[PDB]
Amino acid sequence: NEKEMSLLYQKFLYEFCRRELTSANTTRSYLKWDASSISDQSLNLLPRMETDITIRSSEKILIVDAKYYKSIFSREKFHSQNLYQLMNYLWSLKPENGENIGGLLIYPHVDTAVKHRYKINGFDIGLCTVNLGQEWPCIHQELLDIFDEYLK
Amino acid sequence: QPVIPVRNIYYMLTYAWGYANLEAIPGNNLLDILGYVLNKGVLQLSRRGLELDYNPNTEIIPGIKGRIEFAKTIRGFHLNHGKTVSTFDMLNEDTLANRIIKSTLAILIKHEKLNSTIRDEARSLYRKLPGISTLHLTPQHFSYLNGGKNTRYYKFVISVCKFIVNNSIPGQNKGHYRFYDFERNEKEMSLLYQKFLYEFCRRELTSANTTRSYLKWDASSISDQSLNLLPRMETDITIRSSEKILIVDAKYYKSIFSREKFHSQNLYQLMNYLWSLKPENGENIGGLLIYPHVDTAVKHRYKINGFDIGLCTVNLGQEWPCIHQELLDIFDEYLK
Amino acid sequence: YCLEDALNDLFIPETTIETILKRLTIKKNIILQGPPGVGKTFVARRLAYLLTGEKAPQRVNMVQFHQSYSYEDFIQGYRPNGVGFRRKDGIFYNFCQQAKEQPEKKYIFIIDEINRANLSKVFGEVMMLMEHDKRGENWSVPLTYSENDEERFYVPENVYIIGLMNTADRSLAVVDYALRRRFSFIDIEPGFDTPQFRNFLLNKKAEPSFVESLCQKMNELNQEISKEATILGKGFRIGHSYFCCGLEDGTSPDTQWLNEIVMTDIAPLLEEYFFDDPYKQQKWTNKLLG
Amino acid sequence: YCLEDALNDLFIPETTIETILKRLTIKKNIILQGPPGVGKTFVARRLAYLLTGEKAPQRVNMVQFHQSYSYEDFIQGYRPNGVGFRRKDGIFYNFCQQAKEQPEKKYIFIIDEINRANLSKVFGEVMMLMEHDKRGENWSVPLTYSENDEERFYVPENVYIIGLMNTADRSLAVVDYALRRRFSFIDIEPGFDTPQFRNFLLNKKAEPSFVESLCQKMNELNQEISKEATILGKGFRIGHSYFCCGLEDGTSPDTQWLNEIVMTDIAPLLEEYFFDDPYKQQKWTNKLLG
Amino acid sequence: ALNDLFIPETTIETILKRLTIKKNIILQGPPGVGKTFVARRLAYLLTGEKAPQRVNMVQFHQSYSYEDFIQGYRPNGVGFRRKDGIFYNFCQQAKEQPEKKYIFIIDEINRANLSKVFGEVMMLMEHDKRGENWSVPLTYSENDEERFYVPENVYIIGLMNTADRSLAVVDYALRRRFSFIDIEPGFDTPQFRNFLLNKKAEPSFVESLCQKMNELNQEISKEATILGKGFRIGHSYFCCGLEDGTSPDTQWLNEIVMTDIAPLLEEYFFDDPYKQQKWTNKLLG
Ligand SMILES: Nc1nc2c(ncn2[C@@H]2O[C@H](COP(=O)(O)OP(=O)(O)NP(=O)(O)O)[C@@H](O)[C@H]2O)c(=O)[nH]1
Ligand SMILES: Nc1nc2c(ncn2[C@@H]2O[C@H](COP(=O)(O)OP(=O)(O)NP(=O)(O)O)[C@@H](O)[C@H]2O)c(=O)[nH]1
Ligand SMILES: Nc1nc2c(ncn2[C@@H]2O[C@H](COP(=O)(O)OP(=O)(O)O)[C@@H](O)[C@H]2O)c(=O)[nH]1
Ligand SMILES: [Mg+2]
Ligand SMILES: [Mg+2]
Numbered sequence A: 001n002e003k004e005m006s007l008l009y010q011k012f013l014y015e016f017c018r019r020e021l022t023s024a025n026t027t028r029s030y031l032k033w034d035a036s037s038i039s040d041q042s043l044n045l046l047p048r049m050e051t052d053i054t055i056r057s058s059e060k061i062l063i064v065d066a067k068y069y070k071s072i073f074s075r076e077k078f079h080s081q082n083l084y085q086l087m088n089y090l091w092s093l094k095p096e097n098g099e100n101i102g103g104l105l106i107y108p109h110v111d112t113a114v115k116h117r118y119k120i121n122g123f124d125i126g127l128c129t130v131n132l133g134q135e136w137p138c139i140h141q142e143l144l145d146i147f148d149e150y151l152k
Numbered sequence B: 001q002p003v004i005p006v007r008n009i010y011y012m013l014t015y016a017w018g019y020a021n022l023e024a025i026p027g028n029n030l031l032d033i034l035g036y037v038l039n040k041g042v043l044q045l046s047r048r049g050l051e052l053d054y055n056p057n058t059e060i061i062p063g064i065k066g067r068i069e070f071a072k073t074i075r076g077f078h079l080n081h082g083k084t085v086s087t088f089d090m091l092n093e094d095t096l097a098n099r100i101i102k103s104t105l106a107i108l109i110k111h112e113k114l115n116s117t118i119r120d121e122a123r124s125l126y127r128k129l130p131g132i133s134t135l136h137l138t139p140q141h142f143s144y145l146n147g148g149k150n151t152r153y154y155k156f157v158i159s160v161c162k163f164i165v166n167n168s169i170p171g172q173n174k175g176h177y178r179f180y181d182f183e184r185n186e187k188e189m190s191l192l193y194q195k196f197l198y199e200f201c202r203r204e205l206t207s208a209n210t211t212r213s214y215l216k217w218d219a220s221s222i223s224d225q226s227l228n229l230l231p232r233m234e235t236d237i238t239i240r241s242s243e244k245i246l247i248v249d250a251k252y253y254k255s256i257f258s259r260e261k262f263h264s265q266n267l268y269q270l271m272n273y274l275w276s277l278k279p280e281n282g283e284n285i286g287g288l289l290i291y292p293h294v295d296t297a298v299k300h301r302y303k304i305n306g307f308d309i310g311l312c313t314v315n316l317g318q319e320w321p322c323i324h325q326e327l328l329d330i331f332d333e334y335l336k
Numbered sequence C, D: 001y002c003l004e005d006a007l008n009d010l011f012i013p014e015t016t017i018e019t020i021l022k023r024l025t026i027k028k029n030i031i032l033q034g035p036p037g038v039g040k041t042f043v044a045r046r047l048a049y050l051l052t053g054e055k056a057p058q059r060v061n062m063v064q065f066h067q068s069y070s071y072e073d074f075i076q077g078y079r080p081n082g083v084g085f086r087r088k089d090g091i092f093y094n095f096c097q098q099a100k101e102q103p104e105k106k107y108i109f110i111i112d113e114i115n116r117a118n119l120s121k122v123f124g125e126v127m128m129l130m131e132h133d134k135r136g137e138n139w140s141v142p143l144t145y146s147e148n149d150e151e152r153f154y155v156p157e158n159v160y161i162i163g164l165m166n167t168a169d170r171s172l173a174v175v176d177y178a179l180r181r182r183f184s185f186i187d188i189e190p191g192f193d194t195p196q197f198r199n200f201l202l203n204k205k206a207e208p209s210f211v212e213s214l215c216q217k218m219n220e221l222n223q224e225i226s227k228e229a230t231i232l233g234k235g236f237r238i239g240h241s242y243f244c245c246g247l248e249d250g251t252s253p254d255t256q257w258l259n260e261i262v263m264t265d266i267a268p269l270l271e272e273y274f275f276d277d278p279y280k281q282q283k284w285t286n287k288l289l290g
Numbered sequence E: 001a002l003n004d005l006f007i008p009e010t011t012i013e014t015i016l017k018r019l020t021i022k023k024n025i026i027l028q029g030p031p032g033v034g035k036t037f038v039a040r041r042l043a044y045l046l047t048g049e050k051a052p053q054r055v056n057m058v059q060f061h062q063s064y065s066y067e068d069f070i071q072g073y074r075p076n077g078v079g080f081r082r083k084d085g086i087f088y089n090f091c092q093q094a095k096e097q098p099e100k101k102y103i104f105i106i107d108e109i110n111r112a113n114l115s116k117v118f119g120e121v122m123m124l125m126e127h128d129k130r131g132e133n134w135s136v137p138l139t140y141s142e143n144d145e146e147r148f149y150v151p152e153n154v155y156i157i158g159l160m161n162t163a164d165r166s167l168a169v170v171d172y173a174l175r176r177r178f179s180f181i182d183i184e185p186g187f188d189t190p191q192f193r194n195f196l197l198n199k200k201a202e203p204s205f206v207e208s209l210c211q212k213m214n215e216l217n218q219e220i221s222k223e224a225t226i227l228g229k230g231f232r233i234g235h236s237y238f239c240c241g242l243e244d245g246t247s248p249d250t251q252w253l254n255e256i257v258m259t260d261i262a263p264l265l266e267e268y269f270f271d272d273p274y275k276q277q278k279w280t281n282k283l284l285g
Helices: A002-020 A083-092 A136-151 B006-016 B030-048 B070-075 B096-110 B116-128 B139-147 B154-166 B186-204 B266-276 B320-335 C014-027 C040-052 C091-099 C119-123 C195-203 C208-227 C255-274 C278-289 D003-007 D014-027 D040-052 D091-101 D126-130 D177-182 D195-203 D208-227 D255-273 D278-289 E009-022 E035-047 E087-096 E114-122 E172-177 E190-198 E203-222 E250-268 E273-284
Strands: A025-027 A053-056 A061-064 A101-109 A114-119 A124-131 B053-061 B084-092 B168-170 B177-179 B209-211 B237-240 B245-250 B285-293 B299-303 B308-315 C029-034 C060-064 C076-080 C085-089 C107-112 C159-166 C184-187 D029-033 D060-064 D076-080 D085-089 D107-112 D159-165 D184-187 E024-027 E055-059 E071-075 E080-084 E103-107 E155-159 E179-181
Touching (some): A002 A136, A061 A083, A083 A101, A114 A136, B006 B030, B006 B186, B006 B320, B030 B096, B030 B116, B070 D076, B096 B154, B139 B154, B186 B245, B186 B320, B266 B285, B308 B320, C014 C029, C014 C040, C014 C184, C014 D255, C040 C159, C060 C091, C085 C091, D014 D029, D014 E250, D029 D040, D040 D060, D060 D091, D126 D177, D195 D208, D208 D278, D255 D278, E035 E055, E035 E103, E035 E155, E250 E273
Parallel strands (some): C029 C159, C060 C107, D029 D159, D107 D159, E055 E103, E103 E155
Antiparallel strands (some): A025 A053, A053 A061, B053 B084, B168 B177, B209 B237, B299 B308, D076 D085, E071 E080
C-alpha cells in the first residue's frame, strides 16, 4: 500500500544518499520547536519533528522530505501537502553558521521526470519528479544529477 | 472504540446545513434520530402545506383547455376526432423536491435496523402520498435542486434526505438497507466538524466578522507566475475582528481521543497560513487549534515564532447547551 | 437626443451606461439583470433613443415574455382565418423585415422579463442567428414553416436586442448555457449610494440629513440580504423604486411618509423574505422606523 | 475550396480535423460534441466546403433543431391552404432529391442544436435509412404520407449528415438513444492550450506573456470544473470564443478588455455554476482579473 | 438461407421450437450480432423458402403510432380517407394462404410504447387469443360487423438492444406475451472461424483475433452489476468490409478497431481513459 510505499521510499532514498554520495555527510536529525509556553515546558503535546533526510555541505545544509503519493503517479492539481512540513523544519532550524539553507522535494513518477526551483520566503526550495520503471542503472544515474544541482 | 454520543452529532449537522425534542426517542443510533426528524418534519410541512408547482402539460384532450397549440393540432389531424393539443398548467405536489422526500421514506422503511414505531409512522406517510411518484435517487437529482426555490424549511429535510441516501448500504437482504457507520471514519466527521465551526461562527459570533479566506503564497518562481505545483491553500476559518485577526484549523482524529503520543500534523499547515497571510490593518495575528475530545477539555497557549497559538479541546459528549457555552468561551479568550 | 438628456434623472452611474454601449455595439445582444425596482425597464426604452440617436418609436419595439409565448407567436406560426388556417409572420419576423428596410439606422427589440419563457422554444432558429458574427445574408437559414420555395431568414446586422431579467425569482433563471453565451449580462445595482438618487430627493423639499439617513439604513439591510446565499442571495436586495414614487404631488419626505412605505410594502416583503423568526422582521422594520 | 483558406484560422488541431474527415466519409453521420464557444458551427460550414472542394450553397443545407421541429415539416407533411390540405415536400426530402441527380458530388446537411428535439419525432421512419450501411435504392421505403406504396424515399449514399450538439446542460446526462447508434460522436476540446489560438492573439498586437498567463488561468479554471461530476461535468467548461470576438475594430488586447469580458460574460456564468459557494466565485474572478 | 450463420446451431433450432409454440420471440443482444440478419434468415427457414414477399420488417421509434401501424385517417385531396396500416395490410395477405407462414419483424421494439402502437390488437397477437373466435371490432371501424383477427400463421419477431445504458425497466406489456431469447456475441465459434479461414486469414490470426476480444467481452461481464453482459462487443464488423477480396490481416484489423470499436469503448467507458488505453493496446500488440 501507499503507506508502506511512502515509508519505503523515504528509507530507500536515505541509504541511497549514504552509499552514492560519499563526499557529503547525510543524517536524520531530531529537531526542536522554537516554542515556549508557561503551560508545558517539554512541549510534549506538540508533534515530534524529525527530518526525513539531512545532507550537509560547507556552502549549505540540504533538507529533503519525499513521500509516495498516489495522485502524482497518474497524469491537474498537485498533491504537494508535505511542503507545509518542509518550511516548518527550515523555519524551526536556525543553523549556528547561518550561511544558507537547503530545501528539495523529490517525488516518484512513472511517465516523466520534472524539475523546478522555487524561492518562497527567501528560502531555497526545489520540487522535482523522477520517472520510475525506466531502468534501474540509468535511473540511478538520473537521481545523482538532481542531488548535484540543488546542493550547489 | 469510543465515539461521540449519536444525538450530539445531529446538532453539528444542523449547523453544518445552516438549518426539536429528542428526549422522547429511545433509539440511540443515528438513523433512529434522523428518521424521527424527517418523519416528523414532513408532518410539520403538511400542516402548513407542501409545495405545489405549476407544471405545464401539453397533451391531447377532447376540448379546449388553456392554450391550444394549433400546429400539433392540424399536423396530427386531432380536430377530426374532436381533440386538440392544448397546453395547460396542472397543479401537483409531484415536484422534484417532494418526490425526493417520498423516495427517501422508502429507504427509511427498508432499513433493517430501525425502530419499529418509526417505521410504522413512515409507512403511513408513504401511503399518505399517493399522487407522488417514486424515484431512483442519485446525487445528480439533488444537484439540480441547489437553486433553492424551495422554502427554508424544505431545504432542511432535503439535506436529511441527502444524508440518508449517501449513507445507505445494502445489508442482509438484497432489498433491505443498512446504515453506514458514520462516526468511525475521520474524513466525513472532520469535514462535518470543519463546516460545523464555519457555520457556527457566523451565527453566534455576531461581534466578529467570519470569512473563509483564500491565501496566496509569498513565493515568486523564475519558471512560472502560476505556481500550480505549490499546494492550494485555503483557510478552514478566519474570524476577523478589529482588535485581532484569527485563523482556526480544526480536525477530527481518532488518535487524540486516547488520553501518550499526540497527533498535531495539522499544525504544519497552520503556521504557513499565518506567514503567507499579511494584515493590512496590522492589529495582530493569532492561531487556534481545536479538536474534539470526549472526557474533558484542556486549553494551552503558545508563543512559537512570534505568533500566538492555541491548542485546545472540547468534551463532546458532555451536554449540548454547555458545549455551546464552551465553544463561545474559547473564542472569547483567544479572539481577545 | 444624447446621453446628457437621458442621464439627467437616471440613478444608474454613467459608468455602466457606457459599459452597456461598449458591449451592445460590439455584441449586439445584452441582458440587464438586476433586482426589481432598479429601472431596468426605465433605461431600456431610453437606450433605444441613444443608439439610433433620435426619438422615433417605429425603430423601437417592446414586448414582454409571459411564459405562454411560443415560436408560433414570435416568428412563424399558424393562425385561424375564417374557416381555414393560414400562416402568419410573427412579430420578430415582421420586425427584422422592417430592420432590413434600411440598414443604416439601427433598430431595437426590447424583451422584458426574458427570463420567464422557455427561450429555446421561442427563438428556435434565431438562437444561432441572433449573434453578432452570425448575421447577414451569408448565414441565411430556412425556417420551419417556410414555403416549399426556398426562402431564408437572417437577422440583419443593424438589429439590437435588449433583455430585462429580474434576479429575484431564482427558478426563472437562464440555465441554458448555450443561450447565455449569445447575451451579455450587465448587473444593475440598487442605486442608493449615488448622489444622483440623492439629488432627486433633495430637490423635492427634503432635508439632506434624512436622505443620508435613508441610504445608510437601506444599505445595512441589503448587506444582511446579500450575505446569505441559501435563500436570499445577492440578487434579492431591495430596489430603490419604492422611494422614487408617490412624491409628485408635493409630499415632502419624512419619517411619517417612510412609515407608510415600510409598514405597507417593505414589512410584508421582509416577513416573506425571511419567514423563519419574527424577531428578525421586528428588528429591521423598527430600524427603518427608528 | 483549398484547405489553406480553411485550416489556418481554425483553432482546432489539424490532427482532429483529419479524424473528423475520416469518419464523415466512412459513416456519413457525424456529431461534433463540445461546449459552447468551441467553433462547432464554425467548422461545419467549412468542413462541407472542404469535402465538396468548392464553395457552392446548393450542395450544402443548414438547419437548427428545436422542440417545434417535426417530421411534418422536415420530410413530408400536409400544409393548410386557405381551406384545403396540400401535401408538401420537406427539406430533407427536397434536399436528397437534389442529391439524387448528382451522385458523385458530395452533399452536406448540417443540423445544429440536435439535442433539443427528439430525433425520432422529426426523422421518424427515416432513421432506418439514414444509417450509413442502409443507404441506396435497394433499401427504399414508402413514406407514411405517401398516396401509394409505389412512391419510395431512400437517403442517397452521397449525402453526409453533420450534427452539432452542445453538452452544456444538465438534462443531457440522459443522452438520446437515437443519436448514439446512428451518429458517431466527436469531442471538441475547448483548446486554450493550442498554438493557433495564441497566434490569433499575437497578430492582433498582443504581448506573448499576457497571452500565456491567460491560458494558464483558463486551463486551470476548466480543470476545476472537470473534477466535478454531480453539478458540473466536463462539458460545462468555458469555451474560447469570448476572447476571439471584439477585436475587429483594432482595439488591442489588455487586462481592460479582459476585465469587461470577465465582468460581462464569465463572472455571471460562474454565479450560475457555483451558486452554493459564493466565495468560490470570488476566488476565481479575482484570479482571472489577476 | 442456412449456409453460414455465426450463431450456434443449437440456439437457432431452439428458437424454431420456441417460435412454433409461442409465436412471439424477442431477440436480445449487443449491437453487431446480426439480429436482423438471423431473424431474416430464420423467417425463411420457418417458411422453408427464401422469399421476400411473405416477410415484412419495420423499425419502431417512440413516435410510432397505431395510425401508422394499423389504421389511420390521412387526407386525400379534399377529405379524410382511412388508410390501411402495415400490420393490417400484412394480415390481409396472410389470410389468403393460411397454410403458409407469414412473419413480421419489428426492430427496436423496446423503444416504442407497445400499447399506443398496437392498441386494441395487443390482446389478440398473444398465441392463445388468435383466430376467428377472438375477432374484435377495430377502433376506427365504421361498421361493427367488420373485425380483425390475427391468424395463427402470423409470427412476430422482435429485436431488442441490450447495450443501451438508457434502458432501466422493460415494458410490462412486452414481457407477458413475448419470450425473450438472448443472442450471445458468438465471437468464438466454429462457423465464424471457418468463414474467416476460407477467406485469406491464417489460423494464428484467428486465435489472436478471438483471444483478444474474448478478454474484453469477459471483462465487461465480470463487472456484472456495473455493466451488463449484453454490452459486450459483437462480431458483425469483422464480417463486413471483406467483400472487396482484401486479405484479412492485422493491417486491415486496425481500421475497424480505431474506427468502430474505439468510439464504442469511448461511449461505454466514460470514466477512465487509462482503462481504455489498456484494452486498445492488447488488440494490436
Ligand atoms: N424618475 C426616476 N424613476 C426611476 C429611476 N430609476 C427607477 N425608477 C422608477 O422605479 C420604477 C420601476 O422601474 P423598473 O424599471 O420597472 O424596475 P424593473 O426591474 O423593471 N421592475 P421589475 O423587475 O418588477 O420588472 C419606475 O417608476 C421607474 O421609473 C430613476 O432613475 N428616475
Ligand atoms: N476566427 C476563429 N473563430 C472561431 C474559432 N473557433 C470559434 N470561433 C468563433 O466563435 C464564434 C462562435 O462559434 P460557434 O461555433 O457558434 O460556437 P457554438 O458551439 O456554435 N455555440 P453553441 O454551442 O452555443 O451553439 C464564431 O465567431 C466562431 O467563428 C476559431 O478557431 N477561429
Ligand atoms: N454474412 C453474414 N453477415 C452477418 C452475419 N452476422 C451478422 N452479419 C451482418 O452484420 C451486419 C449488421 O447486422 P445488424 O445487427 O442487423 O446491424 P444493426 O442494426 O446495427 O444491429 C449485416 O450485414 C448482417 O447481415 C453472419 O453471420 N453472416
Ligand atoms: Mg420590467
Ligand atoms: Mg452553433
